[PDB]
Write a protein that holds these residues in place. Structure first.
Motif, short mmCIF file in Angstrom:
data_model
loop_
_atom_site.label_atom_id
_atom_site.label_comp_id
_atom_site.label_asym_id
_atom_site.label_seq_id
_atom_site.Cartn_x
_atom_site.Cartn_y
_atom_site.Cartn_z
N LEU A 163 0.82 -1.22 0.00
CA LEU A 163 0.00 0.00 0.00
C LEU A 163 0.85 1.25 0.00
CD1 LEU A 163 -2.88 -0.80 2.57
CD2 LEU A 163 -2.73 -1.41 0.14
N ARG A 164 0.40 2.25 -0.76
CA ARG A 164 1.04 3.56 -0.81
C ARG A 164 -0.04 4.64 -0.71
NH1 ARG A 164 4.60 1.38 0.73
NH2 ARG A 164 6.72 1.14 -0.15
N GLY A 165 0.40 5.88 -0.52
CA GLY A 165 -0.53 7.00 -0.53
C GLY A 165 0.15 8.30 -0.16
N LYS A 166 -0.63 9.38 -0.19
CA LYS A 166 -0.23 10.67 0.32
C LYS A 166 -1.20 11.04 1.43
CE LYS A 166 1.70 12.62 -3.96
NZ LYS A 166 1.61 13.73 -4.95
N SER A 167 -0.68 11.69 2.46
CA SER A 167 -1.48 12.09 3.63
C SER A 167 -2.82 12.69 3.26
CB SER A 167 -0.71 13.07 4.53
OG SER A 167 0.26 12.39 5.31
N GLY A 168 -3.88 12.05 3.74
CA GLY A 168 -5.24 12.54 3.56
C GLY A 168 -5.87 12.19 2.23
N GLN A 169 -5.13 11.49 1.36
CA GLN A 169 -5.65 11.17 0.04
C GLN A 169 -5.93 9.68 -0.11
OE1 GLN A 169 -2.90 12.79 -2.82
NE2 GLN A 169 -3.49 14.93 -2.39
N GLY A 170 -5.89 8.95 1.00
CA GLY A 170 -6.24 7.52 1.00
C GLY A 170 -5.07 6.58 0.73
N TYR A 171 -5.31 5.29 0.90
CA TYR A 171 -4.32 4.26 0.62
C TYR A 171 -4.70 3.51 -0.63
CZ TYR A 171 -2.49 4.73 5.41
OH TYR A 171 -1.95 5.20 6.57
N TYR A 172 -3.73 3.30 -1.52
CA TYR A 172 -3.99 2.59 -2.78
C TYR A 172 -3.11 1.36 -2.97
CZ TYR A 172 -0.08 5.40 -4.66
OH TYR A 172 1.16 5.98 -4.88
N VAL A 173 -3.61 0.43 -3.77
CA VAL A 173 -2.88 -0.80 -4.07
C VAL A 173 -2.79 -0.91 -5.59
CG1 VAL A 173 -4.94 -2.31 -4.07
CG2 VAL A 173 -2.69 -3.28 -3.56
N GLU A 174 -1.72 -1.54 -6.08
CA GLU A 174 -1.58 -1.76 -7.51
C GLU A 174 -2.46 -2.92 -7.92
OE1 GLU A 174 1.87 -3.46 -10.16
OE2 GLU A 174 2.42 -1.43 -9.62
N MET A 175 -3.15 -2.76 -9.05
CA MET A 175 -3.99 -3.82 -9.60
C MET A 175 -3.78 -3.90 -11.12
SD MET A 175 -7.57 -3.40 -7.43
CE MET A 175 -8.20 -5.07 -7.64
N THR A 176 -4.18 -5.02 -11.74
CA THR A 176 -4.23 -5.07 -13.21
C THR A 176 -5.62 -5.45 -13.66
OG1 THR A 176 -3.65 -7.39 -13.60
CG2 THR A 176 -1.79 -5.81 -13.32
#
Ligand SMILES: CC(C)COc1ccc2c(c1)[C@]1(COC(N)=N1)c1cc(-c3cncnc3)ccc1O2
Length: 369
Positions: free
Chosen positions: A8-21
């Protein structure tokens, strides 16, 4: 599960994202992880905010469901065209499934200017899927089509870049310390739970526990703040105001309408109280409590935002809560587990905690009907 750690990655306050295909050949997208909704929906047109988007014309495995979907929500809206395609998760289990995908074709206030994600992965249940509960959510498709056990867990680590781990199909013991404590999933729509007691610095708020869950309490990785029902927010702020009498603050600040600043390095954590939520336990008359620090609810923007806010949709345990803990969404057993996160941010005095068991009567009366 090592391969899933730190996916998981993200920027403060912009949510957590995961890589998908999605599609064949695979198209890589970054996708917001959201336990507070139930649709898999991806940008499919060249919106200026997007790094990339789903191009259905490039996919041999795309199937059109010939149906539109319209999704307003409290802070924006998106609209799109339903289909199915092959979906996998590069840093998740070694499988590929055919899932529903809403191709986003119009939106308002949905995509974030400057963010690194292009779609949303709704991990909650079919009951709140759009347009209706016959649109099978992604996770249901995953479990139905593979041998992936019916659970996932989240370690949200916070700090600016944020990081964390989504362990799909299991639990990684290196991500937490102590024991997991489980609270029942009251109903399978949102990840709904029951709060039976609230303390600020060990001091019971002494409210009818129905107020804590009016009209629901949910666990939501797609919300930044701890959100509390109006009456409960009011009572919590009064107590937190009192507990932190050392200094004075403006009324706007408690409403999250202006920051307050300390000369760098001299932020007085100690004047700010810990907050405890007691959750309904697994056994009759048994509860456990989770405790967060000001490090969790005073968000850095040295300046700080008060990240507890009032709500008209019930209690929402967002990132402010979840960043203290390793959270297990044990779908198979209709329960959510909490344990102290191995990554959570603490000082050398206080520490986030998960403790039990406690004796709590009439816990069934805390739920709203
Ligand atoms: C089931 C219905 C009632 C709610 O459905 C939705 C639909 C769309 C939707 C979101 C929810 C939302 C808002 O809060 C959550 N959990 N996801 C949501 C949250 C974010 C978000 C999350 N974290 C930080 N910034 C923004 C971005 C988009 C976004 O979109």
């Amino acid at each position: 599960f090592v391969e899933m750690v730190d996916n998981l990655r993200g920027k403060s306050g912009q949510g957590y994202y995961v890589e998908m295909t999605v599609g064949s050949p695979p198209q890589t997208l970054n996708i917001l992880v959201d336990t507070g909704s139930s649709n898999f929906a991806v940008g499919a047109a060249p919106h200026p905010f997007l790094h990339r988007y789903y191009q259905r014309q490039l996919s041999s495995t795309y199937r059109d469901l010939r149906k539109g979907v319209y999704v307003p929500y409290t802070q924006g809206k998106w609209e799109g065209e339903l289909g199915t395609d092959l979906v996998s998760i590069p840093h998740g289990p070694n499988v590929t499934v055919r899932a529903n995908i809403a191709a986003i074709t119009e939106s308002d206030k949905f995509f974030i200017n400057g963010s690194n994600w292009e779609g949303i992965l709704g991990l909650a249940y079919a009951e709140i899927a759009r347009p209706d509960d016959s649109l099978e959510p992604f996770f249901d498709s995953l479990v139905k089509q593979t041998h992936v056990p019916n659970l996932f867990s989240l370690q949200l680590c916070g700090a600016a870049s944020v990081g964390g781990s989504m362990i799909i199909g299991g639990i990684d013991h290196s991500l937490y310390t102590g024991s997991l404590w489980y609270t029942p999933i009251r109903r399978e729509w949102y990840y709904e739970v029951i709060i039976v007691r609230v303390e600020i610095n060990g001091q019971d708020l002494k409210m009818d526990c129905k107020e804590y869950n009016y009209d629901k309490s949910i666990v939501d990785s797609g919300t930044t703040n701890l959100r509390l029902p109006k009456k409960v927010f009011e009572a919590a702020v009064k107590s937190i105001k009192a507990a932190s009498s050392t200094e004075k603050f403006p009324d706007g600040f408690w409403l999250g309408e202006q920051l307050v600043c300390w000369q760098a390095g001299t932020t007085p954590w100690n004047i700010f109280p810990v907050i405890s939520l007691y959750l309904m336990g697994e056994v009759t008359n048994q509860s456990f409590r989770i405790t967060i620090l000001p490090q969790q609810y005073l968000r850095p923007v040295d300046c700080y935002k008060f990240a507890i806010s009032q709500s008209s949709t019930g209690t929402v345990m967002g990132a402010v809560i979840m960043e203290g803990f390793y959270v297990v969404f044990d779908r198979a057993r209709k329960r959510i587990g909490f344990a102290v996160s191995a990554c959570h941010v603490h000082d050398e005095f206080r520490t986030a905690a998960v403790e039990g068991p406690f004796v709590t009567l009439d816990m069934e009366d805390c739920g709203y009907n």
